[PDB]
Design a protein around this nucleic acid. Structure first.
Lengths: 272, 88, 44
RNA sequence: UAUGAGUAGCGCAAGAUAAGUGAGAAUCUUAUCCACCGUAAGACUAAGGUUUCCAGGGGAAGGCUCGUCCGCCCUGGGUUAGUCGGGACCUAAGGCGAGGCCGAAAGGCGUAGUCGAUGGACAACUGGUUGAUAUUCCAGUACUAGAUAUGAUCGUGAUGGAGGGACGCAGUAGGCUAAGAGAUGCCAGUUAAUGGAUCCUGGUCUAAGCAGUGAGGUGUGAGAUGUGUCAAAUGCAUUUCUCUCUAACAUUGAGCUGUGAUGGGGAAGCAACUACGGUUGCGAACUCUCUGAUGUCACACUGCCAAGAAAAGCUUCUAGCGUAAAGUCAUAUCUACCCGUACCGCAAACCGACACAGGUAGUCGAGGCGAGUAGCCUCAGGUGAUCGAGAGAACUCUCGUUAAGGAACUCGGCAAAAUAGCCCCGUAACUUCGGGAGAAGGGGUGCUGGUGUAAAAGCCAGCCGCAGUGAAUAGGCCCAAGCAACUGUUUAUCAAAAACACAGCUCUCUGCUAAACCGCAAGGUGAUGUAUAGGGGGUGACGCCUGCCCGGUGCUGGAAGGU
RNA sequence: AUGAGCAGGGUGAAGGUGUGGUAAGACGCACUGGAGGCCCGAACCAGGACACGUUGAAAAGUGUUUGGAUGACUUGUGGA
């Protein structure tokens, strides 16, 4: 879903348009209170601590149902709203008790589908079953190794997820890129699909509109000083033959993997 | 109790006399309601209120070093009528 | 052009007030140097 | 203490005479003209300055000269609040942080909590008033909150529960109004030199209340299951429907209409006396037309994506409520704290060592032309900014000209020149199809009467002109190539670019208490992020294309053996 | 983080609408309509060039041109 801008002026040359085109109207709900926060990368210490960054707005976040540990209710979707934050969109929900709960939206849902889990429900889009209930070869997200603990894992803005299999205590699941974790089988799960898909291909001309995105620009390492970077500056834009260029910090970057195989993990793996 | 400092005699003091007002001084650690009722006690004069103002200290030179003359809270005694003015 | 100090009252304090200087166990030490010398004043 | 040297400079703008003043006047004061600024060089207001203000007196230094003058000096006064700004309210960003966490120590972190305005909460506004204070002093009107005095009656209804406050940007339309123009109307002068009358002030009302309205949004409600509102709730949103969506109704609302409020304001002037300077007193109409805002409704609406503070004051619900005058309204009269309040503030008080040629919030900001807050001359207002006189040397620098010729000068049309306004014609090249492009080039442009221009140009004829955006103010163009796409950013105290950056494109790393990073750790970022995300490396749109070589290096992976 | 702004005037997209257009869309021309690192040009913010001065008004300027001029703007406030 991508319109264009007409190439009127320079800078407005390509300007791959939005096609929001789908989202319910405007005005997100006011008791969706999450306080705004900008570390701007810099820490408790606060020098920079974290690279090129900054320049968005007072991004008034809002509580999505990260966990959805609720039960078998008319969990009515009402609206699918815009997200400033994350790539997929979002949706309001009222239960029987008259609450304002709120979920990540999907591809093809609609207001009044009221989709819910006990894990009573079947395989239709929007159920928080565990994979102990979900059969083989399905398209899920929101599976996190800690039961009673919502999205930290591959509930994914972007595309959703898939599941190959399961055995015993765990679940043989791909994420992307030929990767499988085996997750605790009675941990919750939301069958379905991501909200937005094409929000990987929008090209936007102005450096300043990427500043409206909110990252101050990224320097190359090249013309930087020997004081600055292992790209040893000198005559011209000279090449770098200095054995696989790297961070301004002190480790090589290309190639090597840095697994930390000595983890609370690695018995939950794929070949890669 | 009588912690009124002194009166103040300007050319506006006679305008205060015609206005049934005064220009009296007290210590800094004060309140216009408190010196109001103190004035009511030792004077039996019927006060409307007092204005606010104090004076900064005047640090000029007085002598061969700097005359660090101090400020004082110029109390504008706003009376009502039908009471005892004091002509001192 | 523009010069360094065009301070306001918050500006002239909030680095050098008696609790600011007193605070960090350190500026009060150099204030105590300023006392053991005992110059024209202390806090500014 | 010389010296240079009585030389540089005398710190960006024009005063002038007469009279006073004194002892001594250029430079002090007045009068009278001139002059300048005037989207300011006005007024008012932040920070700041910290009394510089004013009155009187004086002139040791200071004033870049003089100096009776002064931001200089002595002396004396000068700043007034229930409502103005803050605090006695709340809270962001942040800071401190008992608890706790870790750490040789000091420490550094941090839950509760605590302060922290530039924010959000809320009553007063007109007139007069000094040498100076005015929303502060007082006349008139309030309102806010409390008090004690006084017919309630069970009522209050919380830290809970809601609601609400409560918010992005752009742009258009009105609505009204400040504000301005024109005449009605009022007051005073028919001016003196051809002419011979028209001349300029005129031109009020404050908010609060009382009652409505420009109008706006807004859908409403009712019933039942409540399923909940960590307890409860009649308050709330939704289960389900009767509807019924007239929008009645809930809900806000510029201005105006009267009232408020007949309030003294108001000039030529008039008298009086106070020097007759001045003060006191007295005294005019108070109309309408037209423009009318970016102010106003009001982020009201429309529209578009970078999707847009906070709590608290406030309402509602009940847990409670001696609920018995807690409550509660009438009633009555008082009260309403503390700090700040003067002046200057585009500036001789600020910050530039200085009476400096910088910098310095914000809000208003006249007419006439004029789109215009640009010009240009005069409003209101304010100012003459600090050494002058001579003489017009040469020279130095800012300005105006120039035959004839043109860039022949020079490394280089470098600087200056010249063009530009508005309208109306017209407009190549390639193009990523928008542009180019104001391409270029062309024409017009004053006034008089018509007629048509008022909504409205063009007509006609004439009058003229050296000249018709009469001056001011306001593009030199073209061809071609290289580099860079572009806008941005770039060494303030040299260098703005081909340098950086940038979307883009490429690769690689990271499945999460991420990787990476910061810190001894703790803690935290990364991000309430989840591989379309995060980190690193390259290159820098779009179009085409990215060929070969794993010997070596590094990387990755593997394990037989050596080590 | 909270705020303040940033005169005017063109330009004209997208969007929307309606009819000729269409089986029906694509099309036609209106109408809105302004989005826009749009343009000119004020304040404002810079400093490209040039002259002046350079023991300078000045520890970094003046003066004349020049750019941006609704943004990656400018900048108050108060912080790290």
């Amino acid at each position: 879903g991508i319109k264009v801008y007409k190439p009127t002026t320079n800078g407005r040359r390509n300007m791959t348009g939005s096609d929001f085109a789908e989202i319910t109207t405007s005005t997100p709900e006011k008791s969706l209170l999450v306080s705004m926060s900008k570390t701007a990368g810099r820490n408790n210490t606060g020098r920079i601590t974290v690279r090129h960054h900054g320049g968005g707005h007072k991004r008034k976040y809002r509580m999505i149902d990260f966990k959805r540990t609720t039960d078998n209710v008319v969990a009515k979707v009402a609206t699918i709203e815009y997200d400033p934050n994350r790539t997929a969109n979002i949706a309001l929900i009222v239960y029987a008790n008259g609450v304002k709960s709120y979920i990540l939206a999907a591809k093809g849902l609609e207001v009044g589908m009221t989709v819910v889990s006990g894990p009573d429900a079947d395989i239709k889009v929007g159920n928080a079953l565990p994979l102990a209930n979900i059969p083989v070869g399905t398209l899920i997200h929101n599976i996190e190794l800690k039961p009673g603990k919502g999205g930290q894992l591959v509930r994914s803005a972007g595309a959703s997820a898939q599941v190959l299999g399961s055995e015993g205590k765990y679940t043989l699941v791909r994420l992307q890129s030929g990767e499988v974790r085996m997750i605790l089988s009675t941990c919750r799960a939301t069958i379905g699909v991501v909200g937005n898909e094409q929000q990987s291909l929008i090209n936007l001309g102005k450096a300043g509109r990427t500043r409206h995105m909110g990252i101050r620009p990224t320097v190359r390492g090249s013309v930087m000083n020997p004081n600055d970077h292992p790209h040893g500056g000198g005559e011209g834009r000279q090449p770098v033959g200095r054995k696989s260029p790297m961070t301004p910090w002190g480790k090589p970057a290309l190639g090597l993997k840095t697994r930390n195989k000595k983890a609370k993990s690695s018995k939950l793996i794929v070949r890669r | 109790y009588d912690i009124i400092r002194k009166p103040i005699i300007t050319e506006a003091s006679m305008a205060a006399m015609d206005q049934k007002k005064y220009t009296f001084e007290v210590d800094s650690r004060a309140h216009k309601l408190l010196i109001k009722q103190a004035v009511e006690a030792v004077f039996d004069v019927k006060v409307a209120s007092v204005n606010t103002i104090s004076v900064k200290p005047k640090s000029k030179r007085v002598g061969k070093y700097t005359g660090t003359k101090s400020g004082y809270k110029k109390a504008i005694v706003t009376l009502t009528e039908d009471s005892k003015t004091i002509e001192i | 052009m523009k010069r360094t100090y065009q301070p306001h009252k918050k500006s002239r304090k909030t680095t050098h007030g008696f609790r600011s200087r007193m605070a960090t166990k350190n500026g009060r030490r150099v204030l105590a140097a300023r006392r053991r010398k005992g110059r024209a004043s202390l806090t500014v």
